[PDB]
Design a protein around this ligand. Structure first.
Ligand SMILES: CCCCCCCCCCC(CCCCCCCCCC)(CO[C@@H]1O[C@H](CO)[C@@H](O[C@H]2O[C@H](CO)[C@@H](O)[C@H](O)[C@H]2O)[C@H](O)[C@H]1O)CO[C@@H]1O[C@H](CO)[C@@H](O[C@H]2O[C@H](CO)[C@@H](O)[C@H](O)[C@H]2O)[C@H](O)[C@H]1O
Ligand SMILES: CCCCCCCCCCC(CCCCCCCCCC)(CO[C@@H]1O[C@H](CO)[C@@H](O[C@H]2O[C@H](CO)[C@@H](O)[C@H](O)[C@H]2O)[C@H](O)[C@H]1O)CO[C@@H]1O[C@H](CO)[C@@H](O[C@H]2O[C@H](CO)[C@@H](O)[C@H](O)[C@H]2O)[C@H](O)[C@H]1O
Ligand SMILES: CCCCCCCC/C=C\CCCCCCCC(=O)O[C@H](COC(=O)CCCCCCCCCCCCCCC)COP(=O)([O-])OCC[N+](C)(C)C
Ligand SMILES: CCCCCCCC/C=C\CCCCCCCC(=O)O[C@H](COC(=O)CCCCCCCCCCCCCCC)COP(=O)([O-])OCC[N+](C)(C)C
Ligand SMILES: CCCCCCCC/C=C\CCCCCCCC(=O)O[C@H](COC(=O)CCCCCCCCCCCCCCC)COP(=O)([O-])OCC[N+](C)(C)C
Ligand SMILES: CCCCCCCC/C=C\CCCCCCCC(=O)O[C@H](COC(=O)CCCCCCCCCCCCCCC)COP(=O)([O-])OCC[N+](C)(C)C
Ligand SMILES: CC(C)CCC[C@@H](C)[C@H]1CC[C@H]2[C@@H]3CC=C4C[C@@H](O)CC[C@]4(C)[C@H]3CC[C@]12C
Ligand SMILES: CC(C)CCC[C@@H](C)[C@H]1CC[C@H]2[C@@H]3CC=C4C[C@@H](O)CC[C@]4(C)[C@H]3CC[C@]12C
Ligand SMILES: CC(C)CCC[C@@H](C)[C@H]1CC[C@H]2[C@@H]3CC=C4C[C@@H](O)CC[C@]4(C)[C@H]3CC[C@]12C
Ligand SMILES: CC(C)CCC[C@@H](C)[C@H]1CC[C@H]2[C@@H]3CC=C4C[C@@H](O)CC[C@]4(C)[C@H]3CC[C@]12C
Ligand SMILES: CC(C)CCC[C@@H](C)[C@H]1CC[C@H]2[C@@H]3CC=C4C[C@@H](O)CC[C@]4(C)[C@H]3CC[C@]12C
Ligand SMILES: CC(C)CCC[C@@H](C)[C@H]1CC[C@H]2[C@@H]3CC=C4C[C@@H](O)CC[C@]4(C)[C@H]3CC[C@]12C
Ligand SMILES: CC(C)CCC[C@@H](C)[C@H]1CC[C@H]2[C@@H]3CC=C4C[C@@H](O)CC[C@]4(C)[C@H]3CC[C@]12C
Ligand SMILES: O=C(O)c1cccnc1Nc1cccc(C(F)(F)F)c1
Ligand SMILES: O=C(O)c1cccnc1Nc1cccc(C(F)(F)F)c1
Ligand SMILES: O=C(O)c1cccnc1Nc1cccc(C(F)(F)F)c1
Ligand SMILES: O=C(O)c1cccnc1Nc1cccc(C(F)(F)F)c1
Ligand SMILES: [Cl-]
Ligand SMILES: [Cl-]
Lengths: 613, 613
């Protein structure tokens, strides 16, 4: 077939250079972009239906997620209502819904509980003062998170989500699922367990729950178990029988309605001392400015909460945008969510994000422009104003049971771990380290530890690269490692070394060790021995994989060249990229008889040049 | 001259693979290694002289460095005595001296002061109890540092000193010089300033010193100024006139003797209320076991102290070993220094290390085997037993003045900073960040921040690499960027892209963006538009600089290949290293009609193969 034929002179860097010469409306993204461009002819009915459905789902989700945070049920409605209204303007996406997403709710609740516990705040008990303190701390944390998100949006740094590797995301998700399960089990069992702050908190909580297992309430446990079993069974039959009924079956809403109807009918509150919500405020509360003096004690938590919320939001937005063939702006997502968090924090709400489940519920029922979000907000406010009394007899164990029932997918990555280990050990190590760190630590501390561990793994992978001693395949210009192909012939009196990495301090130490091992000796000892008394004549370095360079690398290269020229051994460089060559130039490498004449394009011109002498 | 001529068939990876087939006495290092091999015939006199000289220097240095730590003068003699005795056995080096090196002393003193201040420990004042508490905390910290060093020596991890980059070392040195200067100025001025713990401590200390400047003592200030001026002048004339007198002139010892003689003669203590040492214990104290319960509050400081001490010791040892043509074992250095720190901590001493200045004093006076260390220890114990009373009238301001006078070299890196910025911006950024962090923080926190910032800089340099669009030089097989050489011709209907970095998640996002920019479009939009309705026909990737790979990179490559094959665009790979090829193989890349037939050795076989069709 085709053959490889070429004829040209041998080109060093100097000769090659001699012969060839070198040398205002998007930042505040309005509704004005699509509102005039609307398609009211057919989109309105779909928007209305989708908004009604997603509002019905989001009301229950906000009521349920208010328990993950140490906030009374009723503020979740505000957290579902205000962020949608303030995101309708600055939002870039077109199919997402805004709400708690209980993981962020659990982070906020952990912060609030650790910053205001029962024994420290109250030495008597005053439920109202404790609730007010918890609400104030939640609002302050929300405001701080919003400020941080807005600041990050202003700086145009939205690529930090790249640093959230998939294995660490999976490990963090599994650990968060464990934390949520433990907290909701504590809620279901109706056992009073004092909070633990610090490391190994979950173990102490589980130990004390098992100790106090003797005080559990029978009715709440039975209701939770029945709800979990029913929801899991209906979800399993929905998953197995999937060709029909594209809309998900609203088993949770039916379960909640039946549970509250029975609770009101037979009055579990006074006959069995059951745990009901017992209180839902009516109307809208006036705004209150949070105290900013607490900002000094909520930095390392607000940073992680903002990062996690933004990452979830952009992930869901991209997943839907690639399906519907459009794009979203990451920095505008930062700006919109920061403004939304500020506005909600001024109105006694906790952090709001995308909730992929509710997003799918909204989209599968005729997903269209953000008018459905406005309709959902209208449904939520109608529920707030009037339907507050009808949900009074509902038990909190039912909501906790639903939250637990929706945790299986977060529990199903332990099956992905073994294949990940089989494919690449580093990814499995990152997964396990992130999971363990998030287990015995706070969630935010675990996230930060996982990020820095990923950075460390990248640095270590760069620091210990591959290296080889190369020889030529006969009658060709192909050089491969001598110990692998069994037909590689070593040239006479010259060594070829490949060091497949950029060169920095760790790499300069590694490269010195590799050179000493490959050449069979070192220049310093032989020079000293020869001075006291009073096999290789050339060395070629293949630098095709050298990405970048620093001052320490240049110093090490200069020292190596000088030491090898002391004992009459020539060192040549080949396949060096240009930008590395100017990096060498501006670091003062080309001084004291270097002259750039020892640089070649590939490792076959150097061999021919050596053979010419 | 010589020409480049080669003739061979075009080799893909599959054809190339088909045609060529692949496939107990050192851990406890004794004195027994050199003691029988001694050269007592001529080495003994040199050892005696060098030991006497270095003991005379080390006595004064230990007495002076005891003020940097919040420990009374007298324990520095123990810290100079015990570590030499316990290092004579396990030591690998042959020319170093063991002692405080005031930077580590200042770190220890900062820890001790922050863990036991005047107001908290004493509500009255009891000097003896405060001194006992400071000594106990110093001993406990020394024991913890020794345990950490021994543990690190057992694990055979001695290459962590590679992570201490030169710019961060220079910045840390400058910041430590500033801290030492401020503390010793506070000591010289004889002004009482309450300690500050936390961030911005040095600024508050300086502000309060300037506020209390009205209470300074005249005699101590005059003595310190005179000592500093005299020492600086003598050192300057010694440096300028250097051809003669190879041994350094002991101006410091003469200054100390004259100062103490005058102080005893005219009795500054009672006539001017001067600050003298006023107390030196006689004899040896019995050992006391430190309380281990404090270990929980000294981890992040002991880690940094151990790392810094080990780094200084190995640096000086290597500098002298390369001169005297021998080698030292890093892990054995860990073991020896950990055992030494444990032994000294059991005997009320602080951390001991190499003190390059005293090492040079020892070596320049006939450097030989470690017998000189034993002689120096003998001189130190003779000074302890008998000469304790003669140093009573000496002022502490003189010692502080000497410590300040020896700080110029640590202050002389601000001149190195500008050239570092001119050569490589990243190194200057690391230097400035380390200096600023060590200024407004603790020294250990600054060191940790500098290490993690170096890791971040390496990760960022890897994450944003170089990329280019390549074309061929006519009548050759050399491909260079089209926009640089002005004679590069772009081939017909094919694009060549070089992405000079390994591929991971940040790199996969960058590579997707680069491919989209280079090819002028993307596959998803054109595929969707063509489906709704119902310039480039080949792409070559130059992967010569791809070092390693992960699962995310493999997934991204698979997705890119599939998306480009959807719209009838062929993607080829060239210059991929072997180990990357097996990494692709074991990640499941070669599924669904890949067949390894799209891999070529270099980017000229791919072009010829394309031209054959
Ligand atoms: C973008 C890149 C990442 C940025 C990350 C930024 C992190 C910022 C941390 C800020 C920080 C360190 C500052 C130095 C950091 C040095 C790092 C060195 C790194 C290298 C080695 C501030 O440190 C000081 O803390 C003081 C309180 O201790 C605080 O209050 C003082 O002054 C007040 C008047 O101003 C006065 O009213 C008050 O009385 C004073 O005390 C000071 O204002 C503040 O300066 C530590 O604070 C963080 O917040 C909490 C504090 O309690 C603490 O909460 C945890 O508690 C749970 C257990 O209970 C735990 O389980 C949770 O997790 C978490 O809820 C966190 O743990 C801690 O971290
Ligand atoms: C190889 C790689 C590096 C390894 C680095 C290892 C560092 C280990 C730090 C250990 C640590 C964090 C543990 C969790 C870390 C989470 C990291 C998350 C990372 C991701 C984001 C322990 O944290 C807890 O601290 C408690 C005390 O607060 C301590 O005592 C509790 O139980 C006791 C009975 O056991 C009981 O008697 C006691 O009453 C209890 O309180 C607990 O035992 C201990 O668990 C923090 O402690 C460190 O030490 C000091 C504590 O005060 C503190 O001192 C600083 O003070 C100066 C200002 O004053 C400051 O200027 C100085 O610098 C420094 O002197 C340090 O700042 C702090 O860091
Ligand atoms: C606090 C910070 C963390 C400390 C703990 C350390 C965390 C990191 C710990 C260690 C890292 C562990 C990585 C995973 C270990 C192998 C798992 C596996 O596949 O099983 C094996 C069998 O799998 P196979 O392929 O079937 O064979
Ligand atoms: C505050 C933070 C401070 C900074 C971080 C501090 C912590 C830093 C911690 C991190 C240390 C991580 C070390 C990883 C080493 C590389 C692993 C690997 O496969 O690469 C190479 C092998 O590895 C080696 O050759 C390495 C040297 C061998 C001996 C090492 C000591 C163990 C002795 C154990 C002896 C018996 C027990 C192979 O690379 P390849 O060719 O690609 O294949
Ligand atoms: C607390 C952590 C640190 C926060 C502060 C930020 C720390 C990092 C800050 C910024 C990094 C600054 C790096 C050095 C700046 C240029 C200095 C220079 O050469 O002068 C310029 C002129 O030099 P020339 O070459 O003559 O022209
Ligand atoms: C807890 C810890 C968490 C993790 C750390 C979190 C913090 C992480 C922080 C660190 C962020 C560091 C960013 C460094 C970027 C690379 C610099 C560089 O020269 O490389 C490339 C350019 O750079 C770019 O092209 C980058 C993109 C440009 C816009 C970026 C936003 C700024 C907008 C500013 C707009 C105006 C204001 C060029 O590379 P080259 O080709 O080699 O030459
Ligand atoms: C289908 C789902 C939604 C129905 C949920 C309704 C809940 C409130 C009902 C269903 C089954 C009920 C339980 C059935 C049996 C008993 C035993 C009796 O000695 C005490 C009441 C108790 C423990 C009931 C409490 C209330 C209960 C848990
Ligand atoms: C080792 C290989 C062959 C296992 C292949 C099957 C995998 C997917 C399954 C089989 C049994 C599973 C384990 C069963 C029990 C536990 C204990 C609990 O902590 C959950 C994780 C863990 C540890 C599971 C991890 C995933 C697992 C190992
Ligand atoms: C990749 C890098 C950033 C990871 C760093 C993790 C470090 C900082 C963490 C991981 C686990 C942590 C330890 C977990 C448990 C305890 C016990 C407690 O009584 C004192 C703190 C101590 C001893 C912690 C010190 C800090 C620690 C060692
Ligand atoms: C050469 C070096 C080592 C000599 C050091 C000796 C010291 C103790 C001597 C040298 C100069 C002396 C000072 C000279 C002048 C005065 C002014 C007088 O009104 C009070 C005493 C005072 C302030 C002296 C104090 C002691 C002093 C500082
Ligand atoms: C105790 C106080 C005074 C400490 C102050 C430390 C800071 C402010 C100092 C110490 C060393 C200084 C640097 C030394 C050298 C240069 C190079 C030149 O281009 C001026 C700026 C720059 C980069 C300086 C910036 C300020 C700097 C970082
Ligand atoms: C900057 C270019 C043009 C010349 C560089 C010359 C170098 C060797 C010298 C000349 C003068 C020096 C500066 C003079 C004074 C100070 C104040 C103090 O904070 C130390 C840093 C700094 C800022 C010095 C840094 C180093 C410096 C800039
Ligand atoms: C590369 C990595 C390790 C750098 C990390 C630097 C971070 C952790 C450090 C650098 C400077 C620090 C800040 C310095 C000063 C203050 C003011 C104080 O009242 C609260 C803490 C706060 C706000 C610190 C928070 C932590 C901080 C932002
Ligand atoms: O997912 C949760 O945590 C959750 C909590 C309370 C109610 N509903 C929840 N989820 C959920 C998910 C899909 C469909 C539905 C619904 F439509 F049936 F309401 C609810
Ligand atoms: O998106 C979802 O549906 C989802 C569900 C459970 C956990 N995590 C989820 N998402 C998700 C995506 C990216 C990053 C993160 C994380 F950062 F919080 F870990 C979460
Ligand atoms: O360097 C110090 O901090 C120091 C402190 C006290 C005494 N002498 C010191 N140094 C020092 C340095 C070189 C030579 C001599 C001496 F030989 F003159 F004693 C002393
Ligand atoms: O070796 C010396 O003489 C010296 C003098 C001043 C500062 N630092 C010195 N050494 C030195 C060498 C390596 C690492 C370190 C550091 F880690 F402490 F910063 C110090
Ligand atoms: Cl969900
Ligand atoms: Cl010194």
């Amino acid at each position: 077939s085709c053959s490889y034929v070429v004829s040209r002179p041998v080109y060093s860097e100097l000769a090659f250079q001699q012969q060839y010469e070198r040398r205002v409306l998007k930042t505040l993204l309005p509704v004005l972009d699509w509102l005039p461009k609307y398609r009211i002819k057919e989109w309105l009915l779909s928007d209305i239906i989708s908004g009604v459905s997603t509002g019905l789902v989001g009301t229950l989700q906000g009521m349920a997620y208010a328990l993950l945070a140490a906030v009374p049920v009723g503020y979740g409605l505000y957290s579902a209502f205000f962020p949608i209204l303030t995101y309708f303007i600055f939002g870039t996406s077109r199919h997402i819904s805004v709400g708690p997403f209980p993981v962020v709710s659990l982070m906020v609740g952990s912060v609030v509980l650790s910053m205001a516990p029962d024994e420290h705040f109250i030495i008597s008990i005053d439920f109202a003062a404790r609730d007010a303190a918890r609400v104030l701390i939640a609002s302050t944390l929300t405001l701080l998170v919003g400020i941080i998100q807005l600041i990050f949006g202003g700086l145009q740094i939205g690529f930090i989500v790249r640093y959230l590797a998939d294995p660490l995301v999976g490990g963090f998700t599994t650990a968060a699922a464990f934390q949520v399960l433990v907290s909701q089990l504590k809620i279901v069992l109706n056992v009073s367990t004092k909070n633990y702050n610090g490391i190994l908190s979950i173990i102490y909580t589980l130990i004390e729950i098992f100790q106090n297992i003797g005080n559990t309430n029978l009715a709440d446990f039975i209701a939770g178990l029945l709800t979990i079993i029913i929801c899991m069974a209906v979800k399993e039959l929905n998953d197995r029988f999937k060709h029909k009924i594209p809309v998900p079956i609203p088993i949770e809403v039916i379960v909640t309605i039946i549970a509250t109807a029975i609770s009101y009918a037979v009055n579990l509150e006074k006959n069995y001392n059951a745990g009901i919500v017992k209180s839902i405020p009516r109307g809208f509360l006036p705004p209150e400015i949070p105290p900013i003096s607490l900002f000094s004690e909520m930095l390392t938590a607000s940073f992680s909460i903002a990062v996690v919320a933004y990452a979830i939001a952009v992930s869901v937005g991209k997943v839907y945008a690639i399906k519907y063939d459009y794009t979203i702006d990451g920095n505008q997502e930062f700006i919109a969510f920061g403004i939304s968090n500020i506005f909600s924090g001024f109105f006694s709400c906790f952090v709001a994000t995308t909730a992929l489940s509710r997003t799918a519920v909204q989209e599968s029922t005729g997903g269209k422009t953000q008018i459905a979000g406005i309709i959902s907000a209208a449904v939520v406010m109608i529920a707030i104003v009037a339907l507050g009394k009808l949900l009074e007899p509902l038990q909190k164990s039912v909501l906790a049971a639903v939250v637990i029932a929706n945790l299986k997918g977060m529990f199903m990555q332990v099956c992905d771990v073994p294949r990940l280990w089989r494919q690449n050990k580093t990814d499995a190590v990152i997964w396990v380290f992130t999971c363990i760190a998030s287990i015995i630590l706070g969630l935010d501390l675990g996230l930060l530890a996982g990020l820095m561990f990923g950075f460390l793994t990248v640095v270590v992978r760069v620091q210990f690269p591959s290296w080889n001693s190369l020889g030529s395949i006969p009658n060709t210009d192909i050089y491969r490692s001598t110990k692998d192909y069994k037909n590689i012939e070593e040239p006479e009196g010259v060594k070829i070394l490949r060091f497949s990495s950029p060169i920095f301090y760790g790499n300069v130490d590694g490269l010195k060790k590799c050179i000493k091992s490959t050449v069979g000796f070192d220049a310093i000892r032989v020079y000293n021995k020869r001075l006291k008394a009073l096999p290789i004549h050339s060395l070629v370095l293949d630098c095709g994989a050298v990405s970048f360079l620093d001052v320490v690398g240049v110093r090490s290269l200069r020292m190596i060249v000088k030491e090898f020229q002391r004992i009459d051994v020539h060192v040549y460089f080949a396949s060096l990229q240009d930008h590395v060559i100017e990096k060498l130039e501006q670091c003062g490498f080309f001084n004291d008889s270097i002259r750039k004449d020892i640089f070649f394009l590939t490792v076959h011109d150097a061999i021919l040049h050596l053979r010419s002498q």
